[PDB]
Point group: D2
């Protein structure tokens, strides 16, 4: 593939319906050696399952709870023992306590929900870039992450999560800003949604939802040297929805 | 003036020549009855004295550090003994741990520094929108806050305060979708700075703006003159934001 | 008022309830003395009559088809006979021929219709900017124009005119950049829809649950050309009650 | 390559150092059958040479002034006598009268300059979509145009092209939502310069190459980007994201 020879870490594979899971799949098709992290022992089995069919193996799977600094550093110590270097890190972690994500925004949003949603979904990505700066030394690789339109504009019940996404995408630009002198490109892919999920379909220009695959392909490219003049981008894979108003 | 009749709470007055002091002035020029909070006990005497010259009294000054829900709540419960309603809350509290705003971003940014920056400089706004929802009921008021170009494009050492602001700025949009129904508008004012001579030559107006200028806009935004504007981020920077080079 | 002592020219007054008039009314109400252009010979009587309720007189009205560079300066040649200098230009004219603004974009959009939509809606701004540069010198004044959300995101039956506003909006920035040196501020107001079935959804979405009024879009527009807003140039002020910020 | 199977009409090829060229090389490399236009009678043979070096031949080269409606017409007519379907149209022609790109924006900008600036740099796209609608129909194709930061922000001596470009970018958006239902995707690459002080600030601390813009340009018109429409993708090292 066009990603042959590169070696990527992949954070937050939790399912195969996931958006993470479309990316890993397309990233193997394109020739990448992969690794995976799983948040907890519950999901440890199914990550390793998926991993094995994605060109990877149980021994390239590590426990990581991105709320923890050490555990992230631990991931980069152990992985660093199978590969002489890392090229790509992928970030697919979206988490805010549900009571923040259903009701009147102003009403339900608590300080602690704000703290968490931001920590898990925004800064984890800076820590990942931090905790792996060394292993991406002189690889000219890249970092990726996932965002949503709700960081640029408002929608029902997405609520405080749009504040996290807005910060992430900022964090993306500042990451591009600093990490780039050593040749790291930081980018993010903003995907469309995967009754009213059909009111989306008929305003989205392509009259259809994007597939976890198309986001994979698009997130694959952004990590390949096909995308090597491209940094600080937020790429929208949403059938063109954001370009609509009425 | 164009604000007479309106009452306004001002959070985060800390110096005579801050953008917040510019706002505070104009809103008084325009007749707003002003109330103030103070960050801690050192600044107390400073804030009371400013308040007194902006038509208010120390009676209308209350202790608040926006890192604590409980003190915040005591603000509106203390004010509510003085006012049977409130029109405006002006949110000019911008802060992050110093070491994060000095160096390479990836290197100097910390979990705890992140969490603080975002707490004080962003969530505090929503905590004020909440804690003051009742006092603002049925008055069709407004909330103003301060952001900066750092939320939208990068620039030296602003670092994590560029994520904070972007989170703020999204909260503007969201608080707007929410409180709009009831008739509260929510807006922000993104000011220019006040060798930074590079900025100036590039800035279309060839100068910087002044807290005066940032305050008239601040004021306008919170006055009935604005009543058709909400969810908006008004750039008071002489055009600098619109230039690429 | 706060425009007191300021002089403005106002282009585009064609109805009594246009955004053009909302501005003109506002701007008078805050002290600015005004001048007006009529698009052609049919609107002269309307425009003049309006102008008198706005402190202006028949004499302060001028003919001008913004498709004509020569008429564009005829305004300023003639105006500078009553006024040694000018402070504001308000630019409020939206027109693409009707067949362009109806149906499927790609099908009904034609080269000429495109040409017109951009020459009227967009270049003309730059031309009032040009033509009146001399009279605005020294006054630390401002130009103001009107845009729409269509330019930045799509909405049915706006078609080519969103292309002509994105051009315009870009134009605002270039003018603001060019003329800032000598003091001229250049900004825009970008109103949401105005009242009189498809519009009822617009207001369920917009944060303030109501459309704006020309009294709102005019105050914004007034303010933006007043020394109160002297720190503001290159800006596109949204007046739509927050519509532009919502997606569902 | 990921464009294998695809056929593509490229508008704008005129120089070795073209952006237009960078896309064609990267596109052909990715396995597309290309086909080109040449503005005047000069540059005719020069297009042809490049064309014959890109797997094409001088019979898939057609005369076209994007200013004249009838030629663009005649382009797709003739092309449909060699080709069954069309998959990609690429639009890489920028031209404003030179005087307009030299001096004070207000002062040098004239109406005629405006007109040409917009007709060439922006209407041409629409017309290419328009006049080549039928050959794309059925195909789930894609269009691609070129833009620049001057639409989004100001800079010296770009002047009216920032206006042309801004329009074009809406034109991307309006097209995309018009031709989406039938499968046509519509995007743009906003490519940086291929300036010395520019370089200092862009994040990668370097300028982009026509191979870097051409790749992404190719990617977007390929089925690997079928979930993308209406975009202004930025290949400039992240310069847009910097203040």
């Amino acid at each position: 593939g066009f990603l042959t020879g590169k070696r990527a870490l992949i954070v937050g594979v939790a399912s195969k319906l996931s958006i993470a899971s479309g990316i890993a799949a397309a990233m193997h098709r394109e020739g990448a050696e992969l690794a995976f992290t799983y948040q907890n022992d519950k999901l440890r089995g199914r990550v390793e399952e998926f991993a094995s069919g994605w060109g990877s193996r149980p021994e390239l799977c590590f426990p990581c709870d991105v709320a923890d600094d050490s555990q992230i550093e631990a991931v980069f110590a152990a992985l660093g023992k199978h590969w002489d270097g890392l090229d790509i890190i992928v970030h697919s972690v979206g988490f805010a306590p549900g009571d923040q994500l259903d009701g009147d925004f102003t009403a339900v949003t608590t300080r602690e929900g704000f703290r968490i949603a931001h920590d898990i979904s925004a800064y984890s990505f800076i820590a990942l870039a931090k905790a792996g700066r060394e292993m991406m030394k002189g690889r000219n690789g890249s970092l990726l992450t996932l965002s949503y339109l709700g960081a640029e504009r408002t929608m029902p019940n997405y609520n405080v999560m749009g504040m996290a996404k807005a910060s992430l995408e900022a964090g993306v630009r500042y990451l591009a800003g600093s990490l780039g002198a050593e040749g790291t490109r930081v980018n993010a892919v903003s995907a469309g949604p995967i009754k009213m999920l059909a009111a989306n379909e008929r305003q989205t220009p392509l009259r259809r939802n994007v597939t976890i695959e198309e986001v994979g392909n698009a997130g694959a490219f952004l990590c390949s040297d096909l995308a090597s003049g491209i940094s600080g981008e937020i790429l929208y894979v949403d059938g063109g929805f954001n370009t609509t108003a009425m």
